[PDB]
Amino acid sequence: VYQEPTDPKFPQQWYLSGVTQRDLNVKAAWAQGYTGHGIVVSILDDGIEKNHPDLAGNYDPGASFDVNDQDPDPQPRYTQMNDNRHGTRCAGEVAAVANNGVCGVGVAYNARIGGVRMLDGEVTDAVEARSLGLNPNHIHIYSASWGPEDDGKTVDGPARLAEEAFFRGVSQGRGGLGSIFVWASGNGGREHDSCNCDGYTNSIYTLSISSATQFGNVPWYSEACSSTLATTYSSGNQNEKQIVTTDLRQKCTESHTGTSASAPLAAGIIALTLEANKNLTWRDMQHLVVQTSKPAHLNANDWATNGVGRKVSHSYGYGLLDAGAMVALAQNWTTVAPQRKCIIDILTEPKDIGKRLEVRKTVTACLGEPNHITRLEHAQARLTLSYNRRGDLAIHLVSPMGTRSTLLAARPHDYSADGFNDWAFMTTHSWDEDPSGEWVLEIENTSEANNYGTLTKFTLVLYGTASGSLVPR
C-alpha cells in the first residue's frame, strides 16, 4: 500500500492530490510506482541552491552548469534582495526530496535535479544555446520559466544558435529520442500579450504550459494563444493558495507564483511519464499530453471542440495535466511514426489587408508523396506582412475540420510598424485532424483606425503522420 509523503508542508500542496479533484492527480502516479527514479531534469534559470536541505539528496552536477560565469557550479549569487531565488523555487517543484521532514515534495521527488545558471547576466543567443544544449545525452528534460519580455509589444524568438540547439536536442538528444523542452507560456496577461508572439512557446519543439488558479480560473497573468499545449495549477488571487517549494537560503516558501511555477510542475509530471516508458520520443510526449489532459471545471469563454472531438482553449490548451493518466497511457505506448512535413505556399500574389482579408485555399496535404499527412500534429501559418500598427491585427486560421485557431489576438500596446517577417504562428488545436481540404486565413483590423498593409507570403506548414489514428473522442 502506497504511503503518501510525511513532509511538513505536503498537506499544503493542494495541487498534487486531494479528495476534491482540483489537482494534477500526481498521487495516483506515485501509487502506480512512479516517482521519477532515474530521470534527469535541468532548470534553466538563475541558478540552483545545490546544498538546499530539500534538494541536496536529488542534486545532479551532471545536469548543471554555470553559463554566466563559465564554471560547473550553478550556485546562485546571493544578494540582499534575494533576486536569484527563481531557479531554486522552480527546482523544488520538480524534485524536492520526500519524507525528510523538510518543506514539501517535488512532483518527481526521486528524480535527479540540476540547474543551469544562465539568467544572471546578459542572456545572449549563445548563452541560450549553451544551456539548451547542455549534456543532452544525460539530461532528459529541460525546464525554462523565462522568455522574451511580456510587455505585449515584443515579437521575438530563438536566434540561430538557440534554434540550432532545439533541433539538435530533439533530433540527437536523449539517444535520438529527443530532448524534452518544457516552457512557461508567459506572464503577459495584464498587457494582453499573446504567447504566439514568443518563439520559444510557439516552437513545436517545446511543450508550452499555461496556468490555472485554484478555483479553476484564468489567472490575471495568463497569456492566451494557439501554441499552448496544456495547463498546470499556479497562483491566482489572494484567497487562492499558491505553490509550495524550496526557497533561497535553505528556506521553504508557500508563495511561489505565476507562469514560472507551471512549467516545473509539468516537467515533473513528464519525468514520471518518462520513468513509466523511457523509450518515448519528444513527439510521443506531446501526443500523451494531448490525449490525457483534462478540461473539466477549468473556466474559459473560448472552449471549442476540435475535429476529433477534443475540447481545446487558447487559455489552457487541452486542459490540466493528469499525471496518473499520463503514466498509465505511457506504459504500453506505441512509438509514433516518423514526422512528416508538408509545405504549402498559399499565395499567388500579394494581398492588401485593408479592414479585413480572408484567404481560402484547398490543399491535398502532399497527397501521393512520402510526406502525405492524414494525421496532423502541429500546424504553422508562416506569415510575411506589412502593417502600420501591428497590435490592431487579429489573425485566425480555420482547419478543414472547422477548428478556428486564434493565431493572434489584438495587442493594444503593440504600436510597431515592423509587421511580421515570416513569423511561424503555430496551433496545437487541430492535433490528430485530417488536414486535407479548405484552410481559411482571416486577418482583420480590430480598430476603427484607417490602417494599411499587405500580406506578401503565407506558407502553411503541416507536421504529422499518415497512420495510427484513434476513434474521435
Binding site: D46, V123, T124, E128, W146, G147
Partner: peptide, 4 residues
C-alpha cells in the same frame, strides 16, 4: 533581452 530575456526575463524571468
Amino acid at each position: 533581452r530575456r526575463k524571468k
